[PDB]
Structure formats: structure tokens, C-alpha cells
Design an enzyme around this catalytic site. Structure first.
Site, PDB file in Angstrom:
ATOM      1  N   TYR B 363       0.799  -1.178   0.025  1.00 23.04           N
ATOM      2  CA  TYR B 363       0.045   0.283   0.185  1.00 23.04           C
ATOM      3  C   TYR B 363       1.027   1.440  -0.193  1.00 23.04           C
ATOM      4  O   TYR B 363       1.986   1.080   0.519  1.00 23.04           O
ATOM      5  CB  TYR B 363      -0.944  -0.056   1.447  1.00 23.04           C
ATOM      6  N   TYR B 375       0.126  -7.434   2.360  1.00 19.32           N
ATOM      7  CA  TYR B 375      -0.042  -8.804   2.448  1.00 19.32           C
ATOM      8  C   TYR B 375       0.628  -9.634   1.316  1.00 19.32           C
ATOM      9  O   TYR B 375       0.617  -9.516   0.068  1.00 19.32           O
ATOM     10  CB  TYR B 375      -1.690  -9.092   1.860  1.00 19.32           C
ATOM     11  N   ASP B 377       0.287 -12.826   0.434  1.00 16.64           N
ATOM     12  CA  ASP B 377      -0.948 -13.649   0.707  1.00 16.64           C
ATOM     13  C   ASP B 377      -0.452 -15.065   0.825  1.00 16.64           C
ATOM     14  O   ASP B 377      -0.820 -15.808   1.861  1.00 16.64           O
ATOM     15  CB  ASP B 377      -2.063 -13.516  -0.245  1.00 16.64           C
ATOM     16  N   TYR B 460      -9.238  -9.606   0.008  1.00 13.95           N
ATOM     17  CA  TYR B 460      -9.166  -9.713  -1.321  1.00 13.95           C
ATOM     18  C   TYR B 460      -9.401 -11.237  -1.790  1.00 13.95           C
ATOM     19  O   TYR B 460      -9.303 -12.095  -0.854  1.00 13.95           O
ATOM     20  CB  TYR B 460      -7.700  -9.874  -2.158  1.00 13.95           C
ATOM     21  N   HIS B 518      -2.753   1.029  -3.855  1.00  9.61           N
ATOM     22  CA  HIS B 518      -1.846  -0.386  -3.725  1.00  9.61           C
ATOM     23  C   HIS B 518      -1.649  -0.712  -4.923  1.00  9.61           C
ATOM     24  O   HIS B 518      -2.354  -0.174  -6.217  1.00  9.61           O
ATOM     25  CB  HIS B 518      -2.358  -1.174  -2.826  1.00  9.61           C
ATOM     26  N   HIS B 520      -1.117  -4.685  -7.136  1.00 10.63           N
ATOM     27  CA  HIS B 520      -1.056  -6.182  -6.877  1.00 10.63           C
ATOM     28  C   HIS B 520      -0.196  -6.876  -7.600  1.00 10.63           C
ATOM     29  O   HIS B 520      -0.148  -6.578  -8.921  1.00 10.63           O
ATOM     30  CB  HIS B 520      -2.718  -6.536  -7.493  1.00 10.63           C
ATOM     31  N   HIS B 683      -3.588   0.102  -8.337  1.00  5.57           N
ATOM     32  CA  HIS B 683      -4.972   0.105  -8.205  1.00  5.57           C
ATOM     33  C   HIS B 683      -5.273   1.367  -7.622  1.00  5.57           C
ATOM     34  O   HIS B 683      -5.135   1.658  -6.436  1.00  5.57           O
ATOM     35  CB  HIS B 683      -5.439  -1.257  -7.329  1.00  5.57           C
TER      36      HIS B 683
HETATM   37 CU   LIG Z   1      -6.959  -3.603  -5.264  1.00  6.67          CU
END
Ligand SMILES: [Cu+2]
Ligand SMILES: [Cu+2]
Ligand code: NA
Ligand code: NA
Ligand code: NA
Ligand code: NA
Lengths: 720, 718
Positions: B363, B375, B377, B460, B518, B520, B683
Site C-alpha cells: 500500500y 499482504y 498472501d 481480497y 496499492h 497487486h 490500483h
Molecule cells: Cu486492489
């Protein structure tokens, strides 16, 4: 008295499934999904029973139906996909009669000459504003139907206008300097002239060809080279590239390399025969039609919508969920999507006044005599509507498609009905959104896209265009490219031969003696967007890494640079997919106070390498003549006469009369009716996988509602 | 007799009654069944079946034999699935192997009482043995082994066990590694918060009346060389909080500027950071439809009435010219192995193993609740473990086949994820077309086989599609949806005074709610053995050169070709305008071109694209995770190098991932390479994405390049 079910229905174009166990027919064709049992009194159409006076008859394993079965069933009305139009939309295309009437009116001027041909005959478009007022307010447009009639009198272009409401000729205007496009009969002429050429037969014999009757010609335009090509600027010329017909249905695989003929269409003679090194014609058979192939087993897959479609086609108007739009067909650019609105909780909001292909170009990168000028402007030079390829049902589009016919004027001014000209189909496109909270029930909804699909074929290539309407308001536009490659004949069988390096300098060696010359495919789309009205401004948002000025331990942050793009010249630009470009409406905000906008994405990916600009030096004429080729985004002030990226009469043009001209004066784009132009291209270095026939390669563009809405568009009707 | 609808539905089948034909149609995965009341036979995928007991209509509802489901569906006429008599060596640990492995380590005296399990996985046999199995059918002569990774309180220990001989092969403590986050950490965090006077007090400040309505969310804290004031050897998580207001969407109700640091071994808050009080946004924003009425739609079905063209044998999948093996990992989810293309009778190697390598969602906001937020993930949360069962018909088309897959939970107990992966074929437009003027048309359908997997981590949800084209191409797409991490702000519209400071780091997407910007960033690990493992990396840059051969053209379209010899040069930005090939310089097609695959790390996306990490090169996250800032990597095959972000990226202090793997700049010349593709989006939020985000997609692609001698879909010769 009766007739064979199976065969009549095939003629008619319906798919026929017999189910032996259920003793049941399933018949499908466009919005009609039909189930009937031999000897049943009723049939089923889209879930609704239909009475048959005469039931289907099985007679020794052979089905027989009444001679009116097909009308009684499909004509029934229980298939509601098509509804007839109360008030003719003002953007409906010229009908066959209108076409016929326009041709009579110009034929009644004393200036009409019987060798005349028609390059285009098309609705002269009423004025944007009345049209919108029709769509939104139902205000009848009270200025009268006119058609544009563009004639080719030998080599001269005359632009005539006719008023069809009043059956009269409003104007007749020669256009100096302009050349006309290539017309169908040009193809025949060229073949003919080559056929009648004693000289040409000789050039051909000494390149190994024993039977000249076997030579397939193909007409290209010559472009413009300020004389270097040695061609008079003011003659109707075409260059002729040649192939040997070997009986494999693929003359494209048998180039007679290094022979060119320049033909003067007026004189009907070959005015020149450029000749270069003799290269043996590649002779191995290379059919792409399957003739030499095993047809394997495929289990069936059907996509079915047994209660009919979710869209309705009323005349040319299409209604689908919250989308409404008007779909028509131009002989030059094909499909046109107009008066597009998005229904927001009751009120139709404007999105696009008119979108269509602007024009395209496929320019090659080899300097040799058969190549240096090769650059197809498919729509502009060859007329892409005219060359529409009928959709192959079930294959060119999915089995749940509905296929429309469309009617344009041919070059001699007679109507032509194109069967299966555009396909319309809904498709499942994965989950619209999903969240699976830990420990909780799941939330998932399907995504549905409505696709309108059109395929056009020019000489060797086959282009597919998809206009895709996402339920959540997004609009995609994709072009797929397939067909057969323009190949160069060479001496090398493999990369080990002495001449491979030289032979492959401008292209890959994709088969023995065959090179796929490198080239680009540059498409451009003219989108007259009116984001919730016509008064728009172009906004830039560039994500940037700015130093952290707020303390804590981060050294940097992600921030945006928002600025306006005040005028045409600054708006003509490369597109960096890392950045955001909005067409905002500055007079209208969403619930959060943000200008309602659409985000414009000229490059949302592709399967070939992407074209960064024109693959030409800045001093090439083609480069000089066609600036649209080198920027991905353009925005110009709305202008009814400004329609083609390549300019209106691009055959042997000498300046840019398209997007270069349209933005020459660098006008204000602040809070005013804009037109958006998206250029997108590939750069095609070939490979064996693409020969003898190229698997479809795709590029994507996208238009996305950007704060055009207040929330997740597809959440559903609020019950509070 | 038992009732037909209740039984079929408990079984998972879809029942359709057609009154016109008096016909039932029953569908489930690969089975497409047609049966009529009172008939003596049924149809299963096009083939006749004798019924023991016909189906009986008793009062407009139907009864069937109690055996029916088995008789019919498990009759063998549905051939989607066949028995695997000889188990592929990459087959995941079964439930029994999992339990066996846990016992073996539970039997050591070094095994400490509350020990948990971060990962229990097949320790794969070596590459060559596995290729030999798949291609020559050689038995692999190696006991089945497992990597057992343990979290003892906060200490990581790697064990290896021999499942065949039931013995422990090794027990390695790992110096300085932190374990990933495990399920039970979520509840500690929540309890620990619930039991903190201090916290209950901090919260009451911010205008929250009932502290039991406060929902915690656990975050890894990163590394900042002490600047965050957090000690390095302590097991920590930072807690962001939200207010549950009954809308089912606590994400829509952040408590801004309140962060707690929890030490998981002490079980307590060891620091509360507090910033300006921002009133919590209150408005109900549910996303589950509770307040909506979907509009009525006509049905659409995709049917394959004669069954599927693919065959699943154990975990091996066969489909047209593709063969490959699909197994599941608790960390990274699905893995695609021993992928070959049957070229006219001969299986040619394409990919040894491909799988998600790692991902990160970092972020761009420096405030107190965000500056550390990122994250990882899979690596930090375990994406396989957090697999979201596919919702039949919605997350995947109605003609998919849905697989179950098994892995071990954090306590070592086997766990069956139902509908963990979807497999489905789909029409993808025309495969090729030419309509020659005046001639009969030529068109063929394109089909693709798709492997779909969905994992959900916190807010997410991510979708992955591994897509096999008939023609030899392989796409890999990542979709992102779910619920945005939002920042509570004072501003209600862009007109309010705080609005501009409020949106410096993101869009105002709802009243008082800003979608923090942020990225991805997904990374795919692709061990390709192009027609064999001995490969080289080749660049082809199309360029514009001056015409030298004469005539009116001043320029031409040429290609710069050259090899990329070593790992550091392979580590590069991707220009979608250039070409990159993994070539096999030892084998060539009919034209003398090396057989190759074109690698396309970026073939498109629906969100703006990240061309690199949006971080100054001196940010710690940028330093720890090099993989974010280059789109293509190639390293020498090493069996222990699998994660672009490193094996133990939680609070790592250096780059143990792709930074370390290419640290020594080795040769990539005619040798076994491993391709890593990074693609990512940037994003910037909009209102259309709130309260729930429409799925957004990125695309990558691997294309045969002169791997074949011609159009591969034309079919065989007669
Ligand atoms: Cu996003
Ligand atoms: Cu091409
Ligand atoms: Na406009
Ligand atoms: Na202008
Ligand atoms: Na490899
Ligand atoms: Na290495």
C-alpha cells in the site's frame, strides 16, 4: 402434402438434434429454441406451447413436416427476440428502396456517365442533437432523410447529395485530386489485363511458369512516394502481385517473387513491369481447408438459452439489461454503434453517441520491389463493410449467437443483402464479483457480456471485431486477426542454406522457401463519447512515487498527478498503460462529488507483440501521410465531417487529411463535445505456427465507467 | 425407494424436469444423464444403461431405487475419471501420509507440546526421475518423503520424514526465521484485543460505545531496521480494527489511526499507536444482496451431453494433445506438472512445474494504519489453505468439473477442500478463419481447457486460471475481486475541506471512505523444459533500420537477436514490444529454427499496469522483495528455490527470494532454466468498486515459437 424435415431445416439454417431415447427433436436457430415430438399436437418454442395442425411424422426413421412448418414455428411470435419498430429510428441505414432511389436521382442528372460506379452510398447523418432528442425524448427529427452518394466517374470522385424525402438532388461536387478506393470490378480488370498481356506472359514464363492461365493476380494500391516509384500522380493505378495456382486452394503459398505490374485502370493496360531476381516459385501443396487432414472426434458442446434471449432487437435497436443502443452498417467501416445509453435506476444516461472502426492499416517492413509499397488501408482502400464475411454459425461465433443480415449498396448501386453479417451473443465471463468471508456464506454473481461481432476479409487477412458490453457499464473493443500470411518467395529451405540470413532479414522463415514478411496491424477506433452529455474534458491521472512528507518510517508514497488536457495537440499522445486518462464531464458529479467519467484504455493487452508506434523512420511518406499510426490516443472537437483516421480519400494521398488534419489547428478540448480515437497495433514477426493458416490473434481496448456511478453497478435494485 | 429430488440434490446433481418430453435431465461434473419415468433404461453421456429399478412417478414427484445414484453415476459410463493404477510421484500427500508424517515427528523427544504445522508437503523426488516416470514409465525408486515444517511457539523447525520406512530423516531448527500466520492467530488477536482494558479504552475514545462489536484483522509488520520500534526476535502482528454494525461488512467501518501490536508468545498488546480521532463511518453497506433484488434473467446452460473431452486419472489430466498433472499445495495452491504436448504421436516436454510463485499487495500511504501494510498472501497466510470452494455455475461455468483436494491444517489434521479447483473447456472464438473471396469458408472453433482456483485472504479474493490452448499456447490469468481495504476520513464529498489531504493517497469512493492506493503483484514460477531441459534465453527486439537494399523506402523493419547469457541480464523489465524466448539450441523445427516458447509476462490487464514497484529504492519493502520491480527472471534450476519472496518472508531483513537466487549471476547457457514472470497492477480506486469490487484481470502467455513446423490445430495427415 409434405417434405423432409432434416433437409428443409438445414436449408433454412437451423441446427437439428434427434434424441432417440426421448423421441424428441431439438431445433435451434437464433433466438428460437424448439422441442418437438414426432406425432405431438403441440411443439415448444422458448418454453411456450405451440399448436400444430399437422404434427411431425416419422416414416421409416425419416422425419417429415408440413410445408408451412418452418413459418408456423419460427415465424410464430413465441420467439420474441425481434420486435418490429413503431417509429423508424433516424439512424436506420438506407434501405434497399432508398438505395434504389438515390441511384435513380443521380442517374437523372445530365452528368451521369454509365461507366460510373458507386464507392459508397450512405445515410447522410442527421444532426447529433435531434438524434439524441429522438432517442431520449422521442422528439421526431424533422429535417428530412438525405443520402451521401460518392461516385467514381472513371478516376474522378464526385460527391453527390440526395434528399429522399423530396426525391431531389441537393448537390453534385467533383473532388479535385482525390483518388477512389479499389472496387470489386477492379479485381477482375486486373486479372484480365494480366491475362491479355503478351509481355506479362513472357516475364512469367521466364520465372518457371509454363501455364499462364494458372496465375492469380491480386491488386494493391501504390501509395505515394513523390515520384520515386516512377508513377504519375494523377492516374488510377494499382500494383499487381502474383501467385501460382497449384490446385491446393491456397495460391497464397506460391508467390512469384520479384515481379510487379502497374496497371492503369482507365487505359486498361499494364503501364510498367518492375522485374527483379528470379526466385523459383514454391511448389509444395499447402491446403488450409482440411482436404489432406484427419477430422478427429469432438464431443459436442452446446451453449443454450432455451427460454430465449435476454436482449431484444427492435428494428436496429438493441435492448439488454441497462444498455440501449442502435446498431447499423456502413459499407466502408462496417458496424456502427450509436446513441448508447446506460439505464441508471430509471434515467437513461448518455455514454456514446457513435462508435465504430475509424480505419486501419497493415504496412510491411521489407524494401524489395514487391513489398516496399505494400500497405493495406483495408476499410478506406477496399471497403470493409462491403467485404464483410458471413459468420459461420457455431464456429465464427458461439452456438447461442443470433445472426443479423445487413443491407448495403454495392458498387453499381444495386442493394446487396449480407447474410449473417453481424453476430450478437451473450456470454458467461466468469464471476462478476466475489467475496468469501472466512466462516461466512459465500457471495458470487455471474458476469455477463453482450458481444456484437463482425468479421471482414480483405485479400489474405480476416479481421474480427467485438464490441463488448459489460453489465457493469464497461465497454470493450477487441480486434482479432486471422487468415493467410503475405509471404515472400526465397531460395532457402532451412536456416542452414547459404541465403537464409539475407532471406530472413525482414521476416521469419516459416516454411521451405517461404518467409513471413514482418508487418504491423494498426487499428483505430472513432468513439464519439458523450459522458452523461456532450460537454466533456480530458483529464490525466499519473500514478507517481512521491517522497513521504508526513513522517513515520516510509521514505515514499503513492500519489496521483491530476491535470487537464486543454487542447487537441496535447491530447494526441502515446498511451502509457501505467497511467489513467479520463473523459470526464465537469458539469456532473457522483454522490462523492467526483466528475462522472469514463476511463479510456487504448491498450488493455494483446497476443502479438504490441506496436509502440509506426515501425517507420520519421521521413517515410507512409509515415508522413498517416500520423494516426503513431499515437495511441487522440481527442478532437466533435465534427460531423471528421470520420477517418487515415483521412477520407487516402488512395495515393500526399498529405495527412485524417487525424493530422483534424488536429492541425490545435483547438480547445475544455468542457466541449469531444471525439476519442484509440489506436492500437501489433508488430507481427511470424512463426511456423502461423502457416499455412494463422491462429486468431487478439488485441483489447477498454472503456470503463470511472466514478460514473455511486457504487458497484451490478449490486441490484435497492429495496429500501 | 427414496425421493428423487432430495437424494440427487444432497448428492450435488442438478435436476431438470421437462414436462413436454416427460424427461429428466441430471447433470453433475462429467455426467449428463437422461431418464424417463417408467423407462427400463437411461442414457449416461450418450450411452444406454439398463436400470435395475425404473424411476417411478409417485404423485407428480419421483422416486428412485436406493442404489440408483451408484448404479447410474458410478456405472462407469461417465468416463471423466479413471483409476490410477500406478501413482504419479508428484501426487500430493494423502490424508494417510499426512497423519503418518505427524506421528513420526510427534514421536521425537524434540517435539514440543503445543507445536503447530506451517506446512506439510510432499518432498518431491528428483526432476529426472519424475520426467522418466511420465515419459518412459520408469518406476521412481525412492521412498515417499515429506517436508514437515513446524512452528514451536514462535520457532521454525524443518523436519523431513520417510513415509515408506516410517523414520525421521532430519530435524533442523531454522535460525531467525519467523513462521507465517496461522488460523489460530486470528482468534488470539481477537481475544487478546477483547481482554485489553487499555484497548477497550483507546476505542471508547474514538466514539465506539460497545467494544465487543469491534472486529480485528491481523497483519504482518514487515521490517524497518528498528524505525517501527519493534524488536526483531519477537513474534508480532499488527491489528487493524473495524466496527461490526450488522451489515455483514465490517470492512466498510474502519476505526482509523488505531493500531495495536500483539506479541503472540506473551499473548498481549505490547504497543498501541494512536493518531487523530476520525469518526467511524456508520452507513450500512452490505454486499450480499440482503438489501437487493436481482433482476430476472433467462437461463443459460453450457452442456456437454456426451461427457468431457478431458480425462482425469488420479491427478493426471489428458486433453487433446495436452497431458499434465495437477496437485495442490497449502502455501501456493495449485501446481501443474510434467506438462507435455503430444506432437503427432510424440510427447514433447513443455513445462516441468508451473505454479503461483508468490504475490504481494503493498500500500502507498504513510499514515499510522498503513505504512507497513503489505499482504504476502501465499507466503504469509497460505493461499492453498485459504482456498475458497468454487460456487458451481457462478465462479465457474456450468459445464466445469469441480475437484476436491486435500492438505493438512495447522494442527496436522487432513483437510478436504471441496470444489477446490475447477476444470472446464470453453469455446474461445474461432481458432482460425479464412474466407477466400468467391470460395467456401474455412473456420475452426477454438477451445481452451481452463484450470481455475480461488483463494481468499482477508478482504481480497484472487482467481487463477491456467489455460491450455489446443494450439500449444498456455495463458495464465489472475483475477482480483472482493472488498477494498479502506481508510476512514472526515470528508464526505470532494467539496469538503479535508477532501484534498484525504485523497492524497487514494480516491474518495464512498462518504468518509477512501480506497487507499496499492498494487497487486503476482509472480509465476515456471520451470519450463522446452523440448528438454537444456535451454537458453533469447531476445528478439524488433527495430527500425535504414534501408540498404535500394528503392524508395528510407527504412525497414528488422530484428535484433541475441542470447541473454547470465541471471543478472535475464532479470529485466519486460517490453511488450519485444520478444523473449526460451529456446532449445539443441533441437530445431523443419525450418532449422530452434524450437522455442515465447514468454509474455504482460499480455494485458483491466487495471492500470505496474511497470515496477511503486517504491523508492530505499524503502525496506523494495529491498526485501526485488521481484516486484522486474517482470522477467530466469535462474538455474534449483529444487530449493521456489518463492520469489523467499521461503520465510515474514519480517525478513534481506531478500531470500529471487534477489538471492540470482545473487551470483550464473550462466543460463544451454542449461536447465526456471522462468519467473512478474505482472502487477496499480490500483486507483473508484466508486464502481464499492462496496464490492468487480473482478479485474491480468493476462500472461507462453506461446510456442517455431516449436512446431506448422499450424498445430490443422489435424494429422491422412
Ligand atoms: Cu486492489
Ligand atoms: Cu499479421
Ligand atoms: Na462526444
Ligand atoms: Na479539430
Ligand atoms: Na526448466
Ligand atoms: Na541461481
Amino acid at each position: 402434402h409434405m417434405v423432409p424435415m432434416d433437409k428443409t431445416l438445414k436449408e433454412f439454417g437451423a441446427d437439428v438434434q434427434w434424441d432417440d431415447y426421448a423421441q424428441l427433436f431439438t431445433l435451434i436457430k437464433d433466438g428460437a429454441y424448439v422441442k418437438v415430438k414426432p406425432g405431438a399436437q403441440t411443439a415448444i418454442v422458448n418454453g411456450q406451447p405451440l399448436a400444430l395442425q399437422v404434427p411431425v411424422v416419422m416414416k421409416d426413421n425419416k422425419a417429415w413436416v408440413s410445408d408451412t412448418f418452418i413459418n408456423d414455428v419460427f415465424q410464430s411470435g413465441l420467439d420474441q427476440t425481434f420486435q418490429v419498430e413503431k417509429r423508424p429510428h433516424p439512424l436506420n441505414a438506407l434501405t434497399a428502396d432508398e438505395i434504389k432511389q438515390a441511384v435513380e436521382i443521380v442517374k437523372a442528372s445530365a452528368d451521369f456517365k454509365p461507366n460510373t460506379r458507386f464507392t459508397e452510398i450512405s445515410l447522410l447523418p442527421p444532426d447529433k442533437e435531434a438524434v439524441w432528442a429522438f432517442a431520449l425524448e422521442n422528439k421526431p427529427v424533422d429535417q428530412p432523410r438525405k443520402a451521401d452518394v460518392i461516385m467514381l466517374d472513371g478516376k474522378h470522385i464526385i460527391e453527390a447529395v440526395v434528399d429522399l424525402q423530396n426525391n431531389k438532388l441537393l448537390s453534385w461536387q467533383p473532388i479535385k485530386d482525390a483518388h477512389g478506393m479499389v472496387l470489386l470490378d477492379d479485381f477482375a480488370s486486373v486479372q484480365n489485363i494480366i491475362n491479355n498481356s503478351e509481355e506479362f506472359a513472357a516475364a512469367v514464363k521466364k520465372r518457371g511458369i509454363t501455364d499462364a492461365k494458372k496465375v492469380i493476380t491480386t491488386p494493391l494500391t501504390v501509395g505515394y512516394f513523390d515520384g520515386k516509384d516512377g508513377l504519375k500522380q494523377d492516374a488510377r493505378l494499382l500494383k499487381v502481385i502474383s501467385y501460382l495456382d497449384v490446385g491446393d486452394g491456397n495460391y497464397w503459398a506460391h508467390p512469384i517473387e520479384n515481379l510487379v505490374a502497374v496497371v492503369d485502370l482507365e487505359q486498361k493496360k499494364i503501364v510498367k513491369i518492375e522485374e527483379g531476381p528470379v526466385v523459383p516459385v514454391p511448389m509444395t501443396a499447402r491446403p488450409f481447408d482440411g482436404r489432406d487432414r484427419v477430422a478427429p472426434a469432438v464431443k459436442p458442446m452446446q451453449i443454450i438459452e432455451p427460454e430465449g434471449k435476454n436482449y431484444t432487437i427492435t428494428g436496429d435497436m438493441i435492448h439488454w439489461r441497462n444498455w440501449d443502443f442502435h446498431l447499423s452498417m456502413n459499407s466502408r467501416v462496417g458496424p456502427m454503434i450509436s446513441t448508447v445509453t446506460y439505464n441508471d435506476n430509471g434515467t437513461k444516461r448518455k455514454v456514446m453517441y457513435e462508435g465504430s472502426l475509424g480505419g486501419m492499416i497493415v504496412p510491411y517492413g521489407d524494401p524489395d520491389i514487391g513489398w516496399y509499397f505494400k500497405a493495406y488501408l483495408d476499410s478506406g482502400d477496399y471497403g470493409m463493410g462491403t467485404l464483410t464475411s458471413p459468420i459461420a454459425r457455431g464456429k465464427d461465433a458461439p452456438s447461442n449467437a443470433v445472426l443479423l443480415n445487413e443491407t448495403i449498396a454495392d458498387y453499381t448501386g444495386v442493394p446487396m443483402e449480407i447474410p449473417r453479417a453481424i453476430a450478437v451473443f451473450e456470454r458467461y465471463a466468469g464471476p462478476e464479483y466475489k467475496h468469501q468471508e472466512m466462516g461466512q456464506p459465500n457471495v458470487s454473481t455471474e458476469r455477463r457480456e453482450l458481444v456484437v461481432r463482425w468479421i471482414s476479409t480483405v485479400g489474405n487477412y480476416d479481421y474480427i471485431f467485438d464490441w463488448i458490453f459489460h453489465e457493469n457499464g464497461t465497454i470493450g473493443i477487441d480486434a482479432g486477426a486471422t487468415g493467410i500470411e503475405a509471404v515472400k518467395g526465397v531460395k532457402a529451405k532451412t536456416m542452414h542454406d547459404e541465403t537464409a540470413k539475407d532471406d530472413t532479414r525482414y521476416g521469419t522463415l516459416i516454411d521451405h522457401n517461404i518467409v513471413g514478411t514482418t508487418h504491423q496491424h494498426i487499428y483505430n477506433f472513432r468513439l464519439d463519447l458523450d459522458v452523461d452529455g456532450e460537454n466533456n474534458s480530458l483529464v490525466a491521472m499519473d500514478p507517481v512515487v512521491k517522497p513521504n512528507t508526513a513522517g513515520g518510517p516510509r521514505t515514499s508514497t503513492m500519489q496521483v498527478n491530476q491535470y487537464n488536457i486543454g487542447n487537441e495537440q496535447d491530447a494526441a499522445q502515446k498511451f502509457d498503460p501505467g497511467t489513467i486518462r479520463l473523459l470526464s464531464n465537469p458539469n456532473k458529479e457522483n454522490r462523492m462529488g467526483n466528475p462522472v467519467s469514463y476511463q479510456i484504455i487504448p491498450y488493455a493487452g494483446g497476443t502479438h507483440p504490441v506496436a509502440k508506434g509506426a515501425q517507420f523512420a520519421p521521413d517515410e511518406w507512409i509515415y508522413h501521410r498517416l500520423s494516426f499510426m503513431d499515437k495511441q490516443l487522440w481527442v478532437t472537437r466533435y465534427h460531423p465531417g471528421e470520420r477517418f483516421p487515415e483521412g477520407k480519400y487516402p488512395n495515393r494521398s500526399t498529405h495527412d487529411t485524417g487525424l493530422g488534419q483534424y488536429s492541425k489547428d490545435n483547438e480547445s478540448l475544455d468542457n466541449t463535445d469531444a471525439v476519442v480515437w484509440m489506436t492500437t497495433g501489433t508488430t507481427h514477426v511470424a512463426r511456423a505456427e502461423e502457416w499455412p493458416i494463422m491462429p486468431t490473434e487478439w488485441v483489447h481496448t477498454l472503456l470503463k465507467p470511472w466514478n460514473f456511478f455511486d457504487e458497484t453497478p451490478t449490486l441490484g435494485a435497492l429495496k429500501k
